[PDB]
Amino acid sequence: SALDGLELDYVRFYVGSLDTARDWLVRGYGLGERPWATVRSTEIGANDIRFVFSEPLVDDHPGTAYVDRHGDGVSDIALRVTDAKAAFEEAVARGARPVAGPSRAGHVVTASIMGFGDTLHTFVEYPDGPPAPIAVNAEEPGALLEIDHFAVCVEHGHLDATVDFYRDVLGFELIFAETIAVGSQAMTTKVVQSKSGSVTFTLIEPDTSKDPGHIDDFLKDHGGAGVQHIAFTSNGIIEAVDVLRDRGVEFMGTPASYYADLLQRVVPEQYSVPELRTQQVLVDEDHDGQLYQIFARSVHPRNTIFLELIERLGARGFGSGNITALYQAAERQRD
Ligand SMILES: [Cl-]
Ligand SMILES: [Cl-]
Numbered sequence: 308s309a310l311d312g313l314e315l316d317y318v319r320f321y322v323g324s325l326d327t328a329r330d331w332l333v334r335g336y337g338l339g340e341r342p343w344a345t346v347r348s349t350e351i352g353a354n355d356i357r358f359v360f361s362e363p364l365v366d367d368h369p370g371t372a373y374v375d376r377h378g379d380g381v382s383d384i385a386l387r388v389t390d391a392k393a394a395f396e397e398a399v400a401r402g403a404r405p406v407a408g409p410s411r412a413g414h415v416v417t418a419s420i421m422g423f424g425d426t427l428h429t430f431v432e433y434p435d436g437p438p439a440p441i442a443v444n445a446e447e448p449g450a451l452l453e454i455d456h457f458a459v460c461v462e463h464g465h466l467d468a469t470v471d472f473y474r475d476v477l478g479f480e481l482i483f484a485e486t487i488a489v490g491s492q493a494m495t496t497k498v499v500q501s502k503s504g505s506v507t508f509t510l511i512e513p514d515t516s517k518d519p520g521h522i523d524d525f526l527k528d529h530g531g532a533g534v535q536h537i538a539f540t541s542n543g544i545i546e547a548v549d550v551l552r553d554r555g556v557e558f559m560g561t562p563a564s565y566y567a568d569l570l571q572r573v574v575p576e577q578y579s580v581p582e583l584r585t586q587q588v589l590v591d592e593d594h595d596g597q598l599y600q601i602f603a604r605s606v607h608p609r610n611t612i613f614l615e616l617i618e619r620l621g622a623r624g625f626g627s628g629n630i631t632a633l634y635q636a637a638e639r640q641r642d
């Protein structure tokens with residue numbers, strides 16, 4: 308019940324240097340910045356996007372154990388609740404494994420449980436509402452408005468246990484389920500979403516009966532399950548990719564063949580094929596509308612986590628055509 312209304316809050320990274328995040332998102336993507344003797348932290352984001360980047364200042368800190376194992380990565384996906392203690396006690400009664408019991412600081416009551424791999428979920432309760440946006444330009448074309456979802460690579464044979472956790476413990480709903488096969492490789496994608504609709508996790512499981520792919524590379528190079536990419540809803544995906552490209556952001560490629568045969572599959576209503584081809588944006592549709600997605604290259608030293616831009620017209624979930632296309636694009640840039 309305290310869990311029923313949970314909303315996506317901040318995404319905490321552990322990083323070796325706060326300036327790697329600054330150079331990446333602030334200087335590259337144009338996000339704003341808003342900055343315990345064991346951790347140095349800064350906040351980066353805009354509108355509804357809120358990242359906390361923390362670099363440990365001592366070896367005896369969880370962030371040092373993280374960066375050693377994974378490098379820079381997502382270590383905690385915080386969930387805003389109206390009551391952090393009540394949400395904690397309910398989730399633990401449901402099976403959740405506690406990481407930190409409820410404690411109050413100044414403007415937050417927090418309680419952390421474990422999530423996929425070694426990534427935490429902190430329940431966070433604010434006294435007067437969530438912090439204000441770091442920067443605001445929601446009405447600007449190409450603006451990055453919110454985090455639409457997260458992609459999570461899981462070890463083979465751990466997908467259904469991950470799904471059961473978020474559904475049984477956290478009450479998420481299953482909104483997508485398909486096994487994707489491309490060439491001699493295959494995967495299983497199951498997307499779970501909070502009843503509030505703001506917390507969406509696409510769970511990806513490699514198919515070990517096939518040949519290995521970039522899913523298998525991530526799991527091996529990251530060091531287990533973790534966030535593969537983070538998707539930013541964009542106030543117009545053609546303009547968001549255009550501006551980012553002018554700032555030095557490199558995106559994954561999609562051959563011209565994709566756009567030559569596109570109108571026999573879908574007729575994009577918002578954009579033209581030349582626009583889509585130029586920016587390398589992928590389009591799909593379902594019963595309610597169309598969906599546009601694109602992946603940015605990973606700038607991570609291990610080539611693991613990367614970023615996605617998405618714009619929804621009527622499409623409220625995920626399409627199998629974009630999922631298949633987005634796999635190929637990621638498979639072409641790394642494995
Ligand atoms: Cl709250
Ligand atoms: Cl990256």
Ligand SMILES: [Fe+3]
Binds near residue numbers: 509536
């Ligand atoms: Fe995605």
